[PDB]
Structure 1
Amino acid sequence: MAVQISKKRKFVADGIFKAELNEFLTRELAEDGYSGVEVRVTPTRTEIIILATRTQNVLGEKGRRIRELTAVVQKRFGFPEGSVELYAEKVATRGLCAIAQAESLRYKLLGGLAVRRACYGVLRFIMESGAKGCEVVVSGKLRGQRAKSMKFVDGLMIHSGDPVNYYVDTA
């Protein structure tokens, strides 16, 4: 059909939509322990599920924020009233999400915590939460013009091959 779109452009369009939605939810829920988003699309309706550490904060006053967000993504993306849904799920083992730990490290540094103390604190928490290894690198300038890159690593780590794709979560 001339109205319809080719499959190659359709998958690309869905990929662009998911990337934009994930980026927007990142810029909005960064202070709310945002981890990720997954979408299950059917021709009848689409279900958008946000994985976050604090769903009690993702939800507004009596669910105001979720209605607010599902309405605003509907207006942007042109969805029908019934084809847009919004659920939030608490992420199990929040210390094993590289994005969640990165957000908390940002919050600690914005508070003013020393780099060594904050990085060692998050490094410990990842380890007792259960992991084969972890590593945090903090780069930039602190109190001076010259910049530094501090590295904090423990446990086993891999870098090469296919296994790093499904073994090492990077943020």
Structure 2
Amino acid sequence: MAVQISKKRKFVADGIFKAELNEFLTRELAEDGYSGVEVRVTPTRTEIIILATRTQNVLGEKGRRIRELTAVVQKRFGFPEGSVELYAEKVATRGLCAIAQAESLRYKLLGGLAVRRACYGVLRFIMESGAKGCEVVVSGKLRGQRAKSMKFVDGLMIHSGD
């Protein structure tokens, strides 16, 4: 960068980078139980911290997938060689994370389990984990050619204000 870019463009471009990285990781690590990414900078080096429920699947047999993911993140975003490091981290209290519960319900439905048996299965596990309340919704062609929806609810739930 022969002359530096203005602060308005700099702060918008840094947000556009985090959005595309989160989309790539979302669809690579879906069955592997992904739930978020965090990124931090230090002189000559960028560290990316990645949260999942089954961290050994993020690593692979001897760390193969961490080496493959380090290579493609560097290759696509234009970092220089060796300035990027990826660290996998285990999710605390996985019953209180909405993304891990939406993905595990998706794979439970995709395996052919019945809709109400699946939905009360996650509704129990969220409330046993110590939430104050929850709301699960499924919609589409549930049983027949005309569309429907189901609400499952327990405990407290606010809708308005900050």
TM-score, with structure 1 as normaliser: 0.90
Q: Is the 8 A contact 2:142 2:149 kept in 1?
A: no
C-alpha distance in 2 between matches for 1:96 and 1:42: 32
How far residue 103 of structure 1 moved from its aligned partner, in angstroms, is 0.4
2-structure distance, mates of 1:147, 1:68: 42
1:32-61 Cα shifts (integer Å, max 9, x gaps): 101011111234211111100110111111
The structure with the largest helix share of the pair is 1
Structure 1 distance, partners of 2:82, 2:11, is: 22
Once the 2 structures are TM-superposed, how far is the Cα of residue 151 of structure 1 from its aligned partner? 0.6
Q: CA offset at residue 4 of structure 1? A: 1.2
Matched, 1:141 2:145: no
Relative to 1, partners in 2 of residues 1:10 and 1:2: Cα closer, same or farther, differing over 3 Å?
Answer: same
Aligned sequence identity (%): 100
User: Unaligned 5+ residue runs, structure 1?
Assistant: 162-171
CA distance in 2, matches of 1:158, 1:42: 40
Q: For structure 1, which segment, 127-136 or 41-50, has the greater mean C-alpha deviation from structure 2 after superposition?
A: 41-50
SS in 2 for 1:151: strand
Partner residue of 1:41?
Answer: 41
| In structure 2, distance between residues paired with 1:43 and 1:123 | 46
CA distance in 2, matches of 1:42, 1:16: 20
Equivalences for residues 86-165 of structure 1 within 5 A:
86-161=86-161
Contact 2:96-2:126 within 8 A present in 1 as well: yes
Question: Alpha carbons of 1:123 and 1:2: their partners in 2 closer, same or farther (altered >3 Å)?
Answer: same
Shift of 1:2: 6.0
Residue 160 of structure 1, CA deviation = 1.2
Q: Give a deviation string over 1:104-151, Cα, whole Å, max 9, x none.
A: 000000001111111100010011111011111011113422111111
Query: Distance in 2 between the 1:79 and 1:70 partners?
Result: 11
Closer, same or farther: CA 43–14 of 1 in aligned 2, 3 Å: farther
Separation in 1 of the partners of 2:135 and 2:70?
36
1:75, distance to aligned residue in structure 2 (A):
0.2
Once the two structures are overlaid, the 10-residue window that deviates more, 42-51 or 60-69, is 42-51
Partner of 1:164: none
Give the direction of change, closer, same or farther, for the CA distance of 1:76–1:150 in structure 2 (3 Å limit).
Answer: same
Q: Is the contact made by 2:132 and 2:155 (CA closer than 8 Å) also made in structure 1? A: yes
Aligned-partner Cα distance in 2 for 1:6–1:43: 21
Cα distance in 2 for partners of 1:2, 1:78 equals 16
- Asked if 1:16 is matched to 2:22, the reply is no
Q: Distance in 2 between matches of 1:151 and 1:91?
A: 27
Confirm or deny: 8 A CA contact 2:108 2:118 kept in the other structure: yes
